[PDB]
Amino acid sequence: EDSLFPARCWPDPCAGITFQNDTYVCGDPRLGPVVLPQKFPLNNELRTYARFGALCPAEFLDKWATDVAPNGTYIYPPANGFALDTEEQPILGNATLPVGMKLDRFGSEYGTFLAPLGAPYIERSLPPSNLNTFDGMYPYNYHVYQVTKEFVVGLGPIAPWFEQPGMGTQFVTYTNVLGLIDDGYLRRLDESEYDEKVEYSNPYTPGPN
Amino acid sequence: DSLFPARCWPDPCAGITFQNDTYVCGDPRLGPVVLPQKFPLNNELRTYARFGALCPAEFLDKWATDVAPNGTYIYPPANGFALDTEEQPILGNATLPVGMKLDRFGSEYGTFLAPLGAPYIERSLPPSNLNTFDGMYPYNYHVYQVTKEFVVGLGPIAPWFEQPGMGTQFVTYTNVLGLIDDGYLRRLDESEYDEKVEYSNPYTPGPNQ
Numbered sequence: 236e237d238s239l240f241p242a243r244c245w246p247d248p249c250a251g252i253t254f255q256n257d258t259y260v261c262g263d264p265r266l267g268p269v270v271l272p273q274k275f276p277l278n279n280e281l282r283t284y285a286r287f288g289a290l291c292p293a294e295f296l297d298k299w300a301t302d303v304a305p306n307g308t309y310i311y312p313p314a315n316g317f318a319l320d321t322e323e324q325p326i327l328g329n330a331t332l333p334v335g336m337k338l339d340r341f342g343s344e345y346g347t348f349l350a351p352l353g354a355p356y357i358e359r360s361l362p363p364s365n366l367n368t369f370d371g372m373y374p375y376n377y378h379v380y381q382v383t384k385e386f387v388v389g390l391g392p393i394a395p396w397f398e399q400p401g402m403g404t405q406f407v408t409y410t411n412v413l414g415l416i417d418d419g420y421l422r423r424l425d426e427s428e429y430d431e432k433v434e435y436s437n438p439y440t441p442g443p444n
Numbered sequence: 445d446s447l448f449p450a451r452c453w454p455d456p457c458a459g460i461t462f463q464n465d466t467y468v469c470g471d472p473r474l475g476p477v478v479l480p481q482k483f484p485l486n487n488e489l490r491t492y493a494r495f496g497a498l499c500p501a502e503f504l505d506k507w508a509t510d511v512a513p514n515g516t517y518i519y520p521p522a523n524g525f526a527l528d529t530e531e532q533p534i535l536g537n538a539t540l541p542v543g544m545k546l547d548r549f550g551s552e553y554g555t556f557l558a559p560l561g562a563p564y565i566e567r568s569l570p571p572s573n574l575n576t577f578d579g580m581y582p583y584n585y586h587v588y589q590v591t592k593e594f595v596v597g598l599g600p601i602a603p604w605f606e607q608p609g610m611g612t613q614f615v616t617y618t619n620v621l622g623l624i625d626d627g628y629l630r631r632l633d634e635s636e637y638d639e640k641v642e643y644s645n646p647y648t649p650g651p652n653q
């Protein structure tokens with residue numbers, strides 16, 4: 236029953252979408268790549284991902300971007316995408332990430348938003364275009380890091396957006412990822428460092444005793 | 445087996461008194477030998493190494509009051525919410541909207557839920573929350589949908605039990621059974637959470653334009 240487009244969108248699911256480049260769904264980079272990961276661990280993070288929810292491409296862009304036409308840009312949630320409390324204030328706190336913690340991210344290293352290693356794509360409230368590849372060394376723009384020196388981030392729940400439920404945890408950094416790497420706070424992990432279950436467990440948090 | 449770190453052989457169950465062969469080392473605190481083979485539970489447990497890199501007795505020594513059968517798991521402070529730099533829990537009161545899907549490992553007399561599909565390692569649960577108590581709910585696993593909006597404590601999950609945590613937890617003010625009896629939640633059949641589209645979000649509105 237799973238498919239690129241909801242069944243309602245056929246026979247012409249790309250109607251209203253201006254074709255630009257055939258790498259992307261309907262030719263539109265905002266709709267993300269046609270090709271998705273078929274191997275662990277990335278396929279595990281995408282197993283619950285219905286890219287448009289129950290919407291069709293033009294409906295999705297009409298809802299979440301300023302225009303269905305190519306000049307339209309995605310609109311992002313207020314308060315940095317933190318889930319809002321009953322007083323419409325973001326839920327978050329400053330928190331120290333411990334040495335050893337593993338983080339990952341879909342996007343360039345000029346960004347400031349990470350998630351705990353292995354968070355489902357739908358928990359991140361990201362649009363489909365964060366899966367576009369810009370560097371062949373990092374398919375799907377997917378990066379994994381490990382904390383090598385303690386540092387403080389804004390930490391809190393992710394608000395739903397982009398037709399997904401959110402409710403992962405996001406870490407919002409004060410320095411971009413590249414600067415954290417170059418300053419010795421993060422190191423990059425290669426696939427052999429995150430392709431076994433034990434690499435997802437936690438050896439750094441001490442026990443109560 | 446692969447239940448155990450290779451370093452734990454021979455006698456990976458050293459120090460563990462055998463009780464019942466449903467469970468690892470015969471110990472219900474260590475969870476079931478047989479893990480789920482179907483979506484979504486297999487997706488939720490694909491990154492779960494139940495002992496981390498510890499051997500069974502080491503795991504219980506770290507996280508329970510006793511390796512002997514009478515030892516009980518020790519739980520994190522502040523109801524398991526991640527702590528900020530001032531050592532206060534990060535959380536807020538939040539309204540769960542009609543349509544949101546939630547899940548839970550545990551009986552309906554409890555009060556802790558997660559967004560549908562959260563990886564087991566994001567929940568900072570001990571292995572015994574996977575034990576089956578009712579044949580109608582293999583692995584203790586329950587799925588719900590909000591039918592009337594209500595307020596919960598909402599916040600990030602601290603690491604515990606050798607896992608990274610950092611999902612979002614919802615701590616309810618009434619137990620789950622009362623929420624069902626009062627019309628706030630309904631129970632979902634497996635048919636209602638075995639398709640990718642059923643994990644997407646149709647209830648959150650798009651930005652005002």
Ligand SMILES: *[C@@H]1O[C@H](CO[C@@H]2O[C@@H](C)[C@@H](O)[C@@H](O)[C@@H]2O)[C@@H](O[C@@H]2O[C@H](CO)[C@@H](O[C@@H]3O[C@H](CO[C@H]4O[C@H](CO)[C@@H](O)[C@H](O)[C@@H]4O)[C@@H](O)[C@H](O[C@H]4O[C@H](CO)[C@@H](O)[C@H](O)[C@@H]4O)[C@@H]3O)[C@H](O)[C@H]2NC(C)=O)[C@H](O)[C@H]1NC(C)=O
Pocket residue numbers: 535536537595617
């Ligand atoms: C989230 O919302 C919570 C309330 O939400 C509602 O209620 C829940 C149960 C659901 O139904 C939900 O759907 C509703 O929306 C909110 O809970 C509130 O938390 C505060 C702070 O913890 C509580 O205040 C404390 O109250 C106790 C009890 O006071 C009564 O008895 C004492 C007897 O000593 C009398 O003196 C009072 O007049 C009351 O009759 C107080 O003992 C306590 O005082 C102590 O702490 C304060 C701190 O300010 C000091 O000033 C004092 O000197 C004491 O040291 C607090 O005043 C409040 O009762 C509680 N409300 C309810 C309805 O339970 C929670 O704080 C929200 N959380 C967040 C993160 O926003």
Ligand SMILES: *[C@@H]1O[C@H](CO[C@@H]2O[C@@H](C)[C@@H](O)[C@@H](O)[C@@H]2O)[C@@H](O[C@@H]2O[C@H](CO)[C@@H](O)[C@H](O)[C@H]2NC(C)=O)[C@H](O)[C@H]1NC(C)=O
Pocket residue numbers: 327328329387409
């Ligand atoms: C979280 O902390 C920031 C301040 O963090 C410091 O500055 C950052 C740039 C980063 O380097 C951190 O590691 C530092 O510890 C708070 O922002 C400050 O808030 C105070 C209070 O009003 C204000 O006077 C300062 O000007 C702010 N400083 C900056 C740089 O913005 C922020 O409010 C904290 N958030 C929470 C939720 O506690």
Ligand SMILES: Nc1ncnc2c1ncn2[C@@H]1O[C@H](COP(=O)(O)OP(=O)(O)OC[C@H]2O[C@H](O)[C@H](O)[C@@H]2O)[C@@H](O)[C@H]1O
Pocket residue numbers: 311341342343344345346347348364365369370
């Ligand atoms: N190598 C690249 N070359 C050119 N453009 C790129 C490249 N990589 C990404 N883009 C484009 O850069 C943009 C994404 O930047 P990014 O750093 O990757 O990922 P984000 O999710 O953190 O940034 C989105 C933020 O923007 C909102 O306001 C919120 O603050 C969001 O957090 C896309 O248009 C890409 O086409």
Ligand SMILES: *[C@@H]1O[C@H](CO[C@@H]2O[C@@H](C)[C@@H](O)[C@@H](O)[C@@H]2O)[C@@H](O)[C@H](O)[C@H]1NC(C)=O
Pocket residue numbers: 253302304305306307
């Ligand atoms: C964005 O562009 C709109 C026109 O786009 C053009 O016309 C439509 C019918 C498609 O054929 C599309 O491929 C073309 O590029 C404008 O009407 C609209 O005002 C523009 N938005 C802004 C903010 O300038």
Ligand SMILES: *[C@@H]1O[C@H](CO[C@@H]2O[C@@H](C)[C@@H](O)[C@@H](O)[C@@H]2O)[C@@H](O)[C@H](O)[C@H]1NC(C)=O
Pocket residue numbers: 461510512513514515
């Ligand atoms: C907890 O249990 C400890 C060991 O109990 C012994 O081993 C188990 C397997 C049973 O056979 C039991 O009958 C044995 O006595 C005790 O040493 C300890 O006192 C108990 N209580 C506490 C609080 O630790």
Ligand SMILES: *[C@@H]1O[C@H](CO)[C@@H](O)[C@H](O)[C@H]1NC(C)=O
Pocket residue numbers: 256257258
């Ligand atoms: C545009 O399409 C061409 C194929 O004609 C492809 O080689 C190129 O990489 C595409 N551009 C992007 C940014 O993907």
Ligand SMILES: *[C@@H]1O[C@H](CO)[C@@H](O)[C@H](O)[C@H]1NC(C)=O
Pocket residue numbers: 464465466
């Ligand atoms: C082990 O536990 C299961 C479930 O509680 C039960 O069905 C089974 O009978 C138990 N085995 C023994 C030998 O008690």
Ligand SMILES: NC(=O)c1cccnc1
Pocket residue numbers: 339340341342348349350359360361365393404405406
């Ligand atoms: N780019 C990401 O992977 C991301 C975005 C928002 C929150 N957490 C992680």
